[PDB]
Structure 1
Amino acid sequence: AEAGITGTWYNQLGSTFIVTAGADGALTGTYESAVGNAESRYVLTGRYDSAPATDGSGTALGWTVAWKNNYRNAHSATTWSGQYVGGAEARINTQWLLTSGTTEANAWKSTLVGHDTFTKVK
């Protein structure tokens, strides 16, 4: 739900995700990573299912962060794909792909894959 997703969330690495869920299915916010070649906040944009299934199914969503801001540029971008599970202890469970810009020769090793779990703070 927009109100359920909107808020501040943190993942197991200590990174911060601040997001606003729009009525049209849009997600905008900022992300601050606790690891990597990153410093300060980065803009994020994404989309979510604004009319999810009325059962105990999660709400599918995804967002992207290109790691360039006014202080640093890592020449990479990460996309998180997952689902929001609301409730008393709402969590957003994701898997992500982090691609670095590389020359053609090194393209085979351009993408890392991982998973992050986010917990919402009050």
Structure 2
Amino acid sequence: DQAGITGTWYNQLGSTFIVTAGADGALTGTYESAVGAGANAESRYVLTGRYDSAPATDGSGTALGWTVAWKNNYRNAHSATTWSGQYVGGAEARINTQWLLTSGTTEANAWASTLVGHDTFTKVKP
């Protein structure tokens, strides 16, 4: 699935996920959020993650995850999102994810530090 995961993906918000899958299980690329703090290189951030480079052959998806820390040369949202999900190959390839967005907070506000949601990615430029 190295070839299948590698490429340019869009989620239902119109965010752009540009990723390279390495033979070793590495995910490297850039994430551009259509939404969030400060809503173009201004909106583009480094991501890293991992994927299962030897998935099951029973038609199971390929487990994968990645992180973005919302700091770049222009902007710092003092937060980080992780996406945890699976790649499903085939004619209309998709990545289905759930995510956790954690903000840096004081101890007093730590209860409210984390948003949760779900993003589905496809290769169709929306």
Give me the TM-score of the superposition, normalised by structure 2: 0.92
Cα distance in 2 for residues equivalent to 1:38 and 1:13: 18
Report the 3-state secondary structure (helix = DSSP H, G, I; strand = E; otherwise coil) of the residue aligned with 1:39: helix
- Measure, in 2, the Cα distance between the counterparts of 1:120 and 1:90: 7
Taking a change above 3 Å as real, the CA distance of residues 46 and 100 of structure 1, as seen in their structure-2 partners, is same
Which ranges in structure 1 are unaligned for 5 or more consecutive residues? none
CA contact (8 A) 1:5 1:84 kept: yes
Distance 1:10 1:39 in 2: 18
Q: CA deviation at 1:61?
A: 0.2
Q: CA deviation at 1:121?
A: 3.8
Cross-structure match for 2:48: 45
> Number of aligned pairs?
121
Cα deviation, residue 39, structure 1? 3.7
Quote the offset at 1:38 in angstroms: 9.9
Contact 1:37 1:74 in 2 (8 A): no
Q: Say if 2:82 is the partner of 1:79.
A: yes
- CA RMSD of superposed structures (Å): 1.9
Quick one: percent identity of the two aligned structures? 98
Deviations 1:46-97 (A, max 9, x none): 0000000012100000000000000000000000000000110000000000
Deviation at 1:40, TM superposition (A): 2.1
Query: Does the CA contact (< 8 Å) of 1:33 and 1:39 recur in 2?
Result: no
Matches of 2:34 and 2:106, distance apart in 1: 27
Q: What is the TM-score normalised by the length of structure 1?
A: 0.95
